[PDB]
Amino acid sequence: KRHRKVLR
Amino acid sequence: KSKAELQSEERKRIDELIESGKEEGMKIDLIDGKGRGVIATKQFSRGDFVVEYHGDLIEITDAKKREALYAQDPSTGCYMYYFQYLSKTYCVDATRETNRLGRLINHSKCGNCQTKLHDIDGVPHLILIASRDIAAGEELLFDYGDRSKASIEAHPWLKH
Ligand SMILES: Nc1ncnc2c1ncn2[C@@H]1O[C@H](CSCC[C@H](N)C(=O)O)[C@@H](O)[C@H]1O
C-alpha cells in the first residue's frame, strides 16, 4: 500500500 | 516598490535558487516515527524560499509505469509528487536517492512549508515556501495532500 504526494 | 516590482524581485531570487540548487540552512536528522526528516539550522522567515522538490520530472504515462513497478517492491518508498500543469498531469519522481533535501521532508497538515508551482519559461518546478517563521532546530513539514481513504488506512499519520 503506497501513498502519494499531491499538489493542492 | 510596486507589487509588480516585489513580485519580479521574488521571482528573481527564486529562479536563482532553482538554478544553483543551493540548499542552505537545513540538515537531515532522524525523527522519531518518521525515518529521516529535514530540520532547519537557521531561522527561515515567512515567505522565504526553502527548497525545490527536486527529482525526475515525468508525464503521466511514465508515472503510472513507474508506480506499477514501485508497487511490486515493498522496500521502495513514496517520493512521487503529482501536480497539474497546462491541463496535463506531471510528477516529480524523487524515488532515486540523491543529496537533494526536498524529497526527505515529512508530512503535516499543520506544517511550516507550502508547495507552489513555479514556472520558468515553460518548465514547471515544485518549490517549498515557508508559510510562517521557522525556528532553528525545528522540522520542516508540508501537507502531502493525499487524503484518500486508501492511503490513510495504511498511513494514518496522513490524517493530521
Ligand atoms: N508525519 C509522518 N509520520 C510518519 N511518517 C512520515 C510522516 N511524514 C512522512 N513520513 C514518512 O516519509 C515517507 C515519505 S518521503 C520523506 C522522507 C522519509 N521520512 C525518509 O526517511 O526517506 C512516508 O512514506 C513515510 O514513511
Q: Do A2 and B71 touch (CB under 8 A)?
A: yes
N- to C-terminal Cα separation, chain A: 22
3-state SS of chain A: helix, strand, coil percent to 5? Answer: 0, 25, 75
Q: Do B150 and A1 touch (CB under 8 A)?
A: yes
8-state DSSP, B42: S
Identity of the residue numbered B35? G
B51 to A8, B14, B121, B149: CA distances (angstroms): 18, 10, 19, 29
| Total domains, chain B | 1
Structure determination technique employed: X-ray
Q: Which helix (H) or strand (E) holds B18?
A: helix B3-20
Give the separation between CA B76 and CA B91, rounded to whole angstroms.
Answer: 17
Q: Which helix (H) or strand (E) holds B152?
A: helix B149-154
Cell of residue B28, nine digits? 537531515
B8, B41, B35, B153: which is closest to B103 by C-alpha?
A: B35
Identity of the residue numbered B44? F
Q: How many CB atoms lie within 10 A of CB B139?
A: 17
Q: Which of A1, A7, A8 is the best mutation test for B, with the most CBs of B within 10 A?
A: A7
Q: Which domain holds residue B5?
A: 1-160
Instruction: List CB contacts (< 8 A) between B144 and chain A.
Output: 3-6
Instruction: List CB contacts (< 8 A) between B52 and chain A.
Output: none
B52, B108, B110, B122: which is closest to B81 by C-alpha?
A: B52
Q: With contact defined as beta carbons under 8 Å apart, do B46 and B132 qualify?
A: yes
Identity of the residue numbered B24? E
Partner residue opposite A4 with nearest CB, options B143, B146, B153: B146
Q: With contact defined as beta carbons under 8 Å apart, do B13 and B22 qualify?
A: no
Cell of residue B2, nine digits? 510596486
Helical H runs in B50-111? 60-70
B70 to A4, B65, B112, B153, B158: CA distances (angstroms): 12, 9, 29, 19, 20
The CATH number assigned to the domain holding B66 equals 2.170.270.10
Q: For residue B22, how far is the Cα from the chain centroid?
A: 15
Angle subtended at Cα B112 by Cα A7 and Cα B130, rounded to the nearest 5 degrees: 80
Could you tell me the resolution of this structure in angstroms?
Answer: 1.6
B48, B37, B115, B109: which is closest to B81 by C-alpha?
A: B115
Q: Do A7 and B145 touch (CB under 8 A)?
A: yes
